[PDB]
Amino acid sequence: VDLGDISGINASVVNIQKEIDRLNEVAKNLNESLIDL
Amino acid sequence: VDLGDISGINASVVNIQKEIDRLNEVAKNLNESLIDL
Amino acid sequence: VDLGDISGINASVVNIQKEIDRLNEVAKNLNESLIDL
Amino acid sequence: ENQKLIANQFNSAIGKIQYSLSSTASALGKLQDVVNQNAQALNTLVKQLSSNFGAISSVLNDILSRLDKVE
Amino acid sequence: ENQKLIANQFNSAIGKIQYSLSSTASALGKLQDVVNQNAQALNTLVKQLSSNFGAISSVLNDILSRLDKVE
Amino acid sequence: ENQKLIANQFNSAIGKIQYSLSSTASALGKLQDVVNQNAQALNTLVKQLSSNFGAISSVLNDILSRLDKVE
């Protein structure tokens, strides 16, 4: 009796922290683009 | 024979409906920012 | 001995490639909206 | 003339950004739906697997009892 | 002079928004890839688990038959 | 006067786009956290299931050995 091996089934992880950091950085930097006549 | 308990393995749920609503609200409100000379 | 059937448990797949393509298309088209006085 | 150009370019950019925000909202909604469906799938699988190992444990215990009796 | 300021600020803002839209597109692509990989993982696991419970059920049925025969 | 209008509309639009970018960043962070938690859940489940099938295989092999001995 040899049960199938499922140890190879792996679940990847996502690392989009660079993109979230860029989005927050742009949301903060857009204050430097406001027009002050 | 005591098989391991896996009942604690839970999968979280995501609730980003507030953010989707804010995005659609902004996509609708940006019409109030169009320039009409 | 009748073990429960778990074959119906299916995991959906997401296809947001249209939206990613629209985002990249807009990020490229916004160059046509730059002001050249 | 330059003001009309600035206004036209700004309105074009705001239209494109509205398009992009609607696309992002749709993408985030689809991702939320799929992630939540897969989470419900994993939870259903965990519940069914707990039930199935309960059944297997009960059956194996009955079998071991029968063997202890026979031998 | 004020027109040059408006144009420069608008071009800077459009550049930053392009950067943000590219970042959002990259993030959504990565999230899509990972969600789909985990979905394929869950489906492969469900298939393999169905096969394994099939095997376990067959073996347990053979064992119970053998016990019914012996006792 | 038209310049003040252009500046006010542009500042309003940039504020709204900042709001939208913060919302998108929050949504992507939440999606990342949930996807990673579900991935860790699937990996923990796979490890525990491998252990449990190891246990079941050992027990079934012992049982089959005992039956071969008895019969």
Author numbering:
A (entry chain F), B (entry chain E), C (entry chain D): 1164 to 1200
D (entry chain B), E (entry chain A), F (entry chain C): 918 to 988
What did the article's authors report about this structure?
Thus, in both cases, the salt bridge between D936 and R1185 is disrupted by the respective variant mutants. The fusion activities of the D936Y, L938F, and V1176F mutations are ∼60% of that of wild type, while the fusion activity of the S940F mutant is ∼25% of that of wild type. Overall, none of the five single and the Omicron triple mutations dramatically altered the architecture of the HR1HR2 bundle, as indicated by the small RMSDs between the wild-type and the mutant structures.
Two heptad repeat regions, HR1 and HR2, distant from each other in the prefusion S, drive membrane fusion by assembly into a six-helix bundle. We therefore designed a scaffold to efficiently determine structures of the postfusion HR1HR2 bundle and its mutants to near-atomic resolution by single-particle cryo-EM.
